[PDB]
Amino acid sequence: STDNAETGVIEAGNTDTDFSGELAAPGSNHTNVKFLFDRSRLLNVIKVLEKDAVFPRPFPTQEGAQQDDGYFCLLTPRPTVASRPATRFGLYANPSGSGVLANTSLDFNFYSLACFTYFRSDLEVTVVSLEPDLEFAVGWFPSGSEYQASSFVYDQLHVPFHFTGRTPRAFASKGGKVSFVLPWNSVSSVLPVRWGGASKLSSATRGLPAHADWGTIYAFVPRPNEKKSTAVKHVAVYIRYKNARAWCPSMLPFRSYK
Amino acid sequence: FCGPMMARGKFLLSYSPPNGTQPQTLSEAMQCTYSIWDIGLNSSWTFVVPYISPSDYRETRAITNSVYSADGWFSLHKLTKITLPPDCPQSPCILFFASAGEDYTLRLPVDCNPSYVF
Amino acid sequence: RGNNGNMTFNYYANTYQNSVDFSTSGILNPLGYLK
Amino acid sequence: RGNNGNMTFNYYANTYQNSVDFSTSGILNPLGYLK
Amino acid sequence: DRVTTQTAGNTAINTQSSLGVLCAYVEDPTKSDPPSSSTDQPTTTFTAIDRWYTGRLNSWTKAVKTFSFQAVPLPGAFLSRQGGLNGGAFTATLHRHFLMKCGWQVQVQCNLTQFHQGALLVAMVPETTLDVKPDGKAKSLQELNEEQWVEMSDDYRTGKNMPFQSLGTYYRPPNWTWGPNFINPYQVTVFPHQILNARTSTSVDINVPYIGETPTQSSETQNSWTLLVMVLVPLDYKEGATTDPEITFSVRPTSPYFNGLRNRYTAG
Amino acid sequence: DRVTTQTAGNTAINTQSSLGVLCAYVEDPTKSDPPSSSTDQPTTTFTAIDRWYTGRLNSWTKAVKTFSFQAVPLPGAFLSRQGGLNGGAFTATLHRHFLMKCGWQVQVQCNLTQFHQGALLVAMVPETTLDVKPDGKAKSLQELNEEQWVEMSDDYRTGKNMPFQSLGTYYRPPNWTWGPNFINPYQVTVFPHQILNARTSTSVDINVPYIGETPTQSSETQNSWTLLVMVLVPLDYKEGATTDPEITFSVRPTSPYFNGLRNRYTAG
Amino acid sequence: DRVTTQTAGNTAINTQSSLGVLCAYVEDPTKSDPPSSSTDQPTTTFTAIDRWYTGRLNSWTKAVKTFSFQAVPLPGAFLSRQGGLNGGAFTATLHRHFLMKCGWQVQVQCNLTQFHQGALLVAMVPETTLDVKPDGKAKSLQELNEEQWVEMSDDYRTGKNMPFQSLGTYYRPPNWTWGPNFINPYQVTVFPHQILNARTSTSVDINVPYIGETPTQSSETQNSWTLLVMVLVPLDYKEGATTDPEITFSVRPTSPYFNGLRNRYTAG
C-alpha cells in the first residue's frame, strides 16, 4: 500500500491490507527478552589456581613481568582480553611465536541477538570441571573490587588469602559442580552493549567501559601451596541472564556474503 | 523509489507460492499474488507476502529444501517503462526493505552462528 | 517471568533471590513516533 | 492422565511441563457410521 | 502540514517540505528529570541556551559511494567546533561543568531538485566511536576536510578498527577480528531516522531524549548520540543541473541539566 | 482522492493520479442476477477468478496518427492470450461452459511526463468486430504485432470492411458501401470512457455491467464489450525525453455466471 | 432403502442395491473449516466442481488371486487421468493452487449376477504409496494397463519395497527388511470400507473427511486417501455366464479449500 518510508515510520501490515485474507494467530512469545536470555551459555574456560596468584597487570604490560595469566574470568558478554575489559575482540590465527597468548572471551550468542544499546540483569553462574574427578572451589569479587593476594602460614603450610574473605567462595564436592546467582553489582545503571564514551579525562580509550561487568571469578584447589601439582587443570564458566531487560534498538553483527 | 520527482512509471510486484519452475514472465507473475505500484507523489509501497503454508509453522533455515522451508518467490517486474523528461538522470533506483508483518511470530530459540567473529 | 516454570514456591525472599532498585522518593508499543 | 499416579503436586506450570496448542480464535464412540 | 517553523529562544528554523518530526522512544523526548546521582542543585535551561545552533557538513557529490558517511558527535561537535558549530553560551556552560545530561532536536538540511536523484539516510545513533580514528585519536577538523566522506569498509562493518588498548610487549599481538562498535549499514534504519530523498524533501527532523549507562555523564567525554548522514542511493543528475549540493544541520539541546560547576576545563 | 488502490482476490492495483472510476449506465454495474434463460444452477464468482488480470498493448509512438487504434475483445483476449493476457482459472472455467454472463472493470495504464503531450481516448465499446479482419478471420497475435496500431480509414468509418458472407457465383457481386459496425471516430466519446491526457493522469478506469441481445451468451463467440484505445492527439516530445511510452491494461470480470458445464471446448 | 440417487451439481448417480453410505470417523465427513495455516482467502466450492467424476478400473477375472489389488490415489488419479478420470474444472483449479484441502465421497460400481460368486474389499486407505513403484517413480497409465492387478507379495506385506533414498557409495548397502507403508491384507477392513459381494450388491459407497499431518497440503504431492479395491474371494461362475465383469468408480471432492493461487503447475 501507499507509503513514504522517508518518514522514519512504516506500519506493519497483513494479508488483508492490500489483498484478501486474515491475520495469522500468534504462535509464541519466544522473542520475549526476559525469556530469551534466560538460559546458560559458555563464557570462558579458565585455569585453576594452585597457589596465591599475582593478578595480571594493566596494559601495556612489558616483557619480564611475573604474573598469572588465564586464571581470572571477567563476567561480561562484552569482549575481554587477559581478564580485563576490551573493545576489539581477538584470537590467534598463528599460535606460533613469542609472547603470552592473551585469553579472550565473548558471549557469541548474546551479541548475535543484542540488537540494543543497553542491557541489565542478574547473573546465574555455573562452573563445570573439564578434568576428571576434580575437587575445586570458586572465588568471586564484585565489579570495582579486586583479588586479595598473598597468603598466611598455618603449620608451615602456605594458605592463600583467597581461601577467606567476605565475598562468595563455593567449594564443590569431588567431581561436583558449582552454581549460584549474583545480582547486578556494577556502579553503572546498565551495561553498555556498545559504548561511545571514555572512563577517564586523560589518555583514555574511547568506547572502553570501566565497569561493564558482574565482577570476576576464579577457581582454585582446596589444598595448600606446598601440595601443588604440575598438570594444569581447567574449568568451564557458564552464565545465564536472569530478569533481563534491554533498551534502545541497535544493530546485529554484519554477516559476510563471501 | 529514489529516482527524480519528474519520473513516472509503474511496477508489478508479485509473490508466487512454490511451483516446479520459478515464474519469469509478466503473464505468469500476473497470475499469482500481485499488486501494481504507481510512481508519483508518495515514494513508497509496502507489499505483504501472505503466509501460505501447509503447516502452521515454517522452517526459518532451509537446511534441506522442502515445502516447509522454501515458500516460493517474490519478484519485481517493470510494468510500463519509466518515463523521464529531457535532462534527467537515467536508471532510477529502488530501495528494498524487509520486516516482519504484524502477525509475524518466531518460535524455538536455536544456537547462534558465531562466524561473524571470524 | 522469563524462562521459569516454577509457579509454586519461592524459598528465598525477593530481595535475596533478586536485586531490586532502591527508591529515589501482547501490547507492543512503537519505539518511534511521528509528530 | 496416562501412566501417572501423582495426584498431589505439580511443581512446574502446565505450559512448561507440557506443550499446549495455540488458539485460532467408558464411552467409546464408533469410528464409522452407516448412513 | 509540510510548512513548519520551529522556534527556540531567539532562533527559528523553517522548512516547506517537512515530513514531520521523528520522536524517538517516547511521544515527548523533552520530558526529563534531574539526575539522581548528584546532590548539588543543577543548572537547568536558560534562554541563552534554549535555541538552535547551525553548522556545516561536507557536500554531497556524484563520487560519494553507497554507505559512505559523515558523523557528528554530540556534544563533541560543540567542543571541537566541527562544521563551524560554535555553541555560544551552551559550550561555555558545558566547559564549566563536570556532568551534563540532555536530549537533542536535530534537523539536517539538503535541498536538491525535482531533476536530481539520490537518497541520504539521516539517523541519530546511540553510543558510537565513529568520530575517532583507529589509533584512538579524535579526527581533527583538517582530517575531516581531507576525507570529506568516510567510505564503508570491512573495518567499519566489523568493528575491527575501533579504538583499543595495545597489550604491550609481554603479549603476542592478537588478530583483531571484530568489535562491538561495528556498523551494519543495512540496519542503520533501526535507529531514530528519516531519509532525505531528493524527490520528497529538502530536510529531515529527529527528536531524541537523553540516554546513557548512568543517570548523567561526563561533559568532556560522553557521546551517547551521534548524528549520522549516510548515502543510500548515489547522487545523480544531468549536465547543467547544480552540482555538489551542500549539507547543513541544526542542533538544539533539550532539557539540559548541568552538575558539578568548576573552573573551565583544561586538558591534562 | 487521486491516490487509490483497488483490491480483488490476491490482487491490487494502485494509481496516484486517478480521475475516479467511470461507471457505465448504473451507479453499481456490479449488481447482476442469474440468467433467466438457463435452468441449471450456475457457477458464480469464486475467489480464484475474482481478481485483476494484466496484459500489454503496443507502445505509443510519435508516428501513430490521429484516430489510429488498438482493440481488446472481451472475453476474446482471454481466449487468445492477446498481450499475454492469460486468464488463469477464469479462462479454464470459460472453456468449460457453453454460456457466460459478466461485467468488466478495466484500467488502462500509460505514464508519460509533464514534458510530453498527447491524448488517448480509452473506451469500452459495445458489440464490435474490430478484432476481425475483413476476410472474416480473427487477427492472430502475429498480425497484431506487425501492424501495432490500426489506422482509421474510409473502410472503418464506413463499416464497408466488416465480416460478411460471400453470395456465391449465382449472384452478381455487389458494391459494398456501408456496414452497421462502422466507427465514427468523432463520436467514440459517446461510450463509457475516460481520456488519458499526458498532462493529467497515467491511468483511466471504467466499470461496465453485462449487456447482450439475450440474458446470457456463448462463451466462445460473444464480444459485447471491446476495450478501445484510440489516439486523439498525436504524441510529441523533445529529443532526450523517453520515447515510445508503453501501454498496459488490467481487466477484472465482475459478477460472472457460467452455465452449461461440459468438457473443454474443442474447435470443430 | 436400497434404491438411492445422489445428486451433486449437474451430476447424479443411482443404485438399486445400496448398502447405505459408510461415513468415516464422523457422522458428517462433509463439515470442514478453512486451513489455519494460510492467511489468504481460500477458493471454496463452486458449482462446476461440486459433482461426481467417473472413471474406470481394470476388469475382474477368474485369474485374479486373493489379495490382489488396484489402487486409486486421490487427488493423484485426477492429475494423471488414471482410468480416464478427467477432473474438468476441479483439476484446472488444483493445478493452479499450491495448497488443497478436501474430503471425498466415492462409489465403486461392479455388477455381477445371482449366479456369480466372489467378493471385493473396497476401502479408503490413509497415507499410502501403493501407486508408486519401488524405484520411486509413479506407475504410468501403460504400466497399470500391463499388470491389470497388483499381486499381494512378501514385499507389499512387508513394506520392504516402498520408495526410499539410496545411501550412496560411502555406505554399505543394507538389507531392507521392512517399511512402515506395509499392507497387512487381513486387516484392510480396519479402514472405512464396504465389501462388494457378488450376492449382495452391485456397488458400495464411502464418505471420508479431510485428514493430513498438517491443516492443508501440497496439491501436487499429497496422497492422504487412496481408493483400494482388493480381492477377498476369487471370482467364479459356470460356462455361459458373462465373463470379466467391469469395474468403474465415481469420486466427488467435498468441502474443498484451495490456497496459494498461481500460474499453472509446471514440472521442474
Note whether B23 and G251 are within 8 A (CB): no
Q: D32 — contact with chain G (CB < 8 Å)?
A: yes
Task: Label residue C6 exposed, middle or buried (CB < 10 Å: 0-12, 13-18, 19+).
Answer: exposed
- Please indicate whether, in this complex, the C-beta atoms of B41 and F54 are within 8 angstroms of each other: no
CA nearest neighbour of G46 among G10, G13, G76, G97: G10
Give the contacts of F224 (CB within 8 A, at least 6 positions apart): F74, F126, F127, F210, F211, F212, F217
- Please indicate whether, in this complex, the C-beta atoms of A27 and D24 are within 8 angstroms of each other: no
Q: How far apart are CA G89 and CA F92, in angstroms?
A: 7
Give first-to-last CA distance, chain F, whole Å.
51
Q: Which residue of D has its CA nearest to A24?
A: D24
Chain C residues with CB under 8 Å of D9 CB are 8
Long-range (24+ apart) CB contacts under 8 A made by G175-182 are: G181/G127, G181/G128, G181/G129, G182/G156, G182/G157, G182/G158
* DSSP annotation string for G185-208: GGGGGGSSEEEEETTT-SEEEEEE
In this structure, what are the phi and psi dihedrals at residue F185, rounded to the nearest 5 degrees?
A: -50, -35
- Using only C-alpha atoms, chain F has a radius of gyration, in whole angstroms, of 19
Q: Which domains does chain A have, with CATH numbers?
A: 1-258 (2.60.120.20)
Chain D residues with CB under 8 Å of C7 CB are 12-13
A contact residues 216-235, partner B, Cβ 8 Å cutoff:
none
Q: How far apart are CA F13 and CA D33, in angstroms?
A: 50
Q: Residues of A at the F interface (Cβ-Cβ below 8 Å)?
A: 1-2, 18-20
Q: How far apart are CA G96 and CA G262, in angstroms?
A: 5
* Sequence letter at residue G211: I
Q: What domain range is E64 assigned to?
A: 1-268
- Count of domains for chain F: 1
Q: Which residue has the cell 567431581?
A: A175
- CA distances to E16, F228, G90 from E199, in Å: 14, 35, 50
Note whether F121 and F108 are within 8 A (CB): no
Q: How far apart are CA B30 and CA B13, in angstroms?
A: 9
Q: F84 — contact with chain B (CB < 8 Å)?
A: yes
Q: How far apart are CA G108 and CA A189, in angstroms?
A: 77
- Using only C-alpha atoms, chain G has a radius of gyration, in whole angstroms, of 19
Which other chains touch chain A, taking contact as 3+ CB pairs less than 8 Å apart? B, C, D, E, F, G
- Please indicate whether, in this complex, the C-beta atoms of E199 and B3 are within 8 angstroms of each other: yes
* DSSP annotation string for G7-23: EETTEEEEESS---EEE
In CATH, what number is assigned to the domain containing residue G210? 2.60.120.20
Q: G211 — contact with chain D (CB < 8 Å)?
A: no
Provide the 8-state DSSP code for A137: E
Task: Label residue E80 exposed, middle or buried (CB < 10 Å: 0-12, 13-18, 19+).
Answer: middle
- Please indicate whether, in this complex, the C-beta atoms of G21 and D34 are within 8 angstroms of each other: yes
Q: Which residue of C has its CA nearest to D17?
A: C5
Q: Residues of C at the A interface (Cβ-Cβ below 8 Å)?
A: 1-4, 17-19, 30-34
- Chain C touches chain F, with at least 3 Cβ pairs below 8 Å, answer no
Q: How far apart are CA E10 and CA E103, in angstroms?
A: 19
CA nearest neighbour of A147 among A82, A254, A54, A227: A54
Q: Residues of A at the G interface (Cβ-Cβ below 8 Å)?
A: 14-16, 19-25
- Please indicate whether, in this complex, the C-beta atoms of E115 and B4 are within 8 angstroms of each other: yes
Q: How far apart are CA G78 and CA G94, in angstroms?
A: 9
- Please indicate whether, in this complex, the C-beta atoms of A243 and C31 are within 8 angstroms of each other: no
E contact residues 162-181, partner B, Cβ 8 Å cutoff:
177-178
CA nearest neighbour of E177 among A81, A90, A108: A90
Q: How far apart are CA E232 and CA E194, in angstroms?
A: 12
Provide the 8-state DSSP code for A160: E
Note whether F97 and F178 are within 8 A (CB): no
CA nearest neighbour of E193 among E107, E264, E80: E107
- Please indicate whether, in this complex, the C-beta atoms of D34 and G36 are within 8 angstroms of each other: no
* DSSP annotation string for B12-60: EEEEE---SS---SHHHHTTSEEEEEE-SSS-EE------B-SSSS--S
CA nearest neighbour of E121 among E200, E71, E194: E194
In this structure, what are the phi and psi dihedrals at residue F135, rounded to the nearest 5 degrees?
A: -75, -5
- Please indicate whether, in this complex, the C-beta atoms of B50 and A2 are within 8 angstroms of each other: no
* Sequence letter at residue E241: A
- Please indicate whether, in this complex, the C-beta atoms of A28 and D22 are within 8 angstroms of each other: yes
> What is the three-state SS of chain F?
CCCEEEEECCEEEEECCCCCEEECCCCCCCCCCCCCCCCCCCEECCHHHCCCEEEEECCCCCCCCCCCEEEEEECHHHHHCHHHCCCHHHHHHHCCEEEEEEEEEEEEECCCCCCCEEEEEEEEEECCCCCECCCCCECCHHHHHHHCCECCCHHHHHCCCCCCCCCCCCCCCCCCCCCCCCCCHHHHHHCCEEEEECCCCCEEEEEECCCCCCCCEECCCCCCEEEEEEEEEEEECCECECCCCCEEEEEEEEEEEEEEECCCCCCC
Q: Which residue has the cell 545552533?
A: E53
- Please indicate whether, in this complex, the C-beta atoms of B80 and F247 are within 8 angstroms of each other: yes
Give the contacts of E62 (CB within 8 A, at least 6 positions apart): E234, E235, E236, E237, E243
Q: How far apart are CA F152 and CA F149, in angstroms?
A: 9
Chain C residues with CB under 8 Å of A181 CB are 17
Q: How far is A37 from chain C (nearest CA, A)?
A: 8
Side-chain-side CA neighbours of F194 within 13 Å: the count stands at 25
Which other chains touch chain G, taking contact as 3+ CB pairs less than 8 Å apart? A, B, D, F
- Please indicate whether, in this complex, the C-beta atoms of G25 and D31 are within 8 angstroms of each other: yes
Q: How far apart are CA E232 and CA E117, in angstroms?
A: 11
Q: How far is B86 from chain A (nearest CA, A)?
A: 26
Q: C32 — contact with chain E (CB < 8 Å)?
A: yes
* Sequence letter at residue B116: Y
Between B4, B97, B116, which is nearest E199 by CB?
B4
Note whether A147 and A162 are within 8 A (CB): yes
Give the contacts of B41 (CB within 8 A, at least 6 positions apart): F3, F16
| A&C contacts, CB < 8 Å | 30
- Angle at the Cα of G125 from the Cα atoms of G120 and G129, rounded to 5 degrees: 110
Q: Which residue has the cell 491475520?
A: A23
Q: B112 — contact with chain E (CB < 8 Å)?
A: no
Q: What is the grid cell recorded at B58? A: 515454517
Helix, strand, or coil (residue A43): strand
Q: How far is B26 from chain G (nearest CA, A)?
A: 11
- Chain F touches chain D, with at least 3 Cβ pairs below 8 Å, answer no
In this structure, what are the phi and psi dihedrals at residue G55, rounded to the nearest 5 degrees?
A: -140, 180
- Please indicate whether, in this complex, the C-beta atoms of D25 and A25 are within 8 angstroms of each other: yes
| A&G contacts, CB < 8 Å | 17
- Please indicate whether, in this complex, the C-beta atoms of A207 and E174 are within 8 angstroms of each other: no
CA nearest neighbour of A237 among A123, A144, A143, A135: A123
- Chain C touches chain D, with at least 3 Cβ pairs below 8 Å, answer yes
In this structure, what are the phi and psi dihedrals at residue B26, rounded to the nearest 5 degrees?
A: -60, -40
Q: Which residue of D has its CA nearest to G18?
A: D35
CA nearest neighbour of E102 among E22, E178, E45, E25: E45
Task: Label residue A133 exposed, middle or buried (CB < 10 Å: 0-12, 13-18, 19+).
Answer: exposed
Q: How far is E146 from chain A (nearest CA, A)?
A: 23
- Please indicate whether, in this complex, the C-beta atoms of E192 and C32 are within 8 angstroms of each other: yes
Note whether F194 and F10 are within 8 A (CB): no
Q: G26 — contact with chain D (CB < 8 Å)?
A: yes
Note whether G204 and G194 are within 8 A (CB): yes
Q: Which residue of G has its CA nearest to D30?
A: G25
Q: A109 — contact with chain B (CB < 8 Å)?
A: yes
- Please indicate whether, in this complex, the C-beta atoms of A9 and C30 are within 8 angstroms of each other: yes
Chain A residues with CB under 8 Å of D25 CB are 25
Helix, strand, or coil (residue E187): helix
Helix, strand, or coil (residue E217): strand
- CA distances to A3, A125, F107, F120, F206 from F19, in Å: 20, 68, 11, 14, 10
Q: How far is G52 from chain A (nearest CA, A)?
A: 30
- Angle at the Cα of G47 from the Cα atoms of G45 and G48, rounded to 5 degrees: 100
Question: What was the elucidation method?
Answer: X-ray
- Please indicate whether, in this complex, the C-beta atoms of F56 and B26 are within 8 angstroms of each other: yes
- CA distances to B100, E111, E152, F228 from E246, in Å: 36, 8, 21, 50
* DSSP annotation string for E167-185: --TTBPPPEEEE-TT---G
The H or E element that residue A111 is part of is helix A108-113
- Angle at the Cα of G222 from the Cα atoms of G258 and G205, rounded to 5 degrees: 85
* DSSP annotation string for chain G: ---EEEEETTEEEEESS---EEEESSS-TT-----TTB-BPPEE--GGGSS-EEEEEPPP-TTPPTT-EEEEEETHHHHHTGGG---HHHHHHHTTEEEEEEEEEEEEE----TT-EEEEEEEEEES--TTB-TTSPBPPHHHHHHHSSBPP-HHHHHTTTS------TTSPPP-----TT---GGGGGGSSEEEEETTT-SEEEEEE----SSSSEETTT--SEEEEEEEEEEEE--BTBPPS--EEEEEEEEEEEEEEE-S-----
Q: Which residue of G has its CA nearest to D31?
A: G25
Chain B residues with CB under 8 Å of A12 CB are 99-102, 104
Q: How far is E250 from chain B (nearest CA, A)?
A: 25
Between D9, D11, D15, which is nearest C6 by CB?
D11
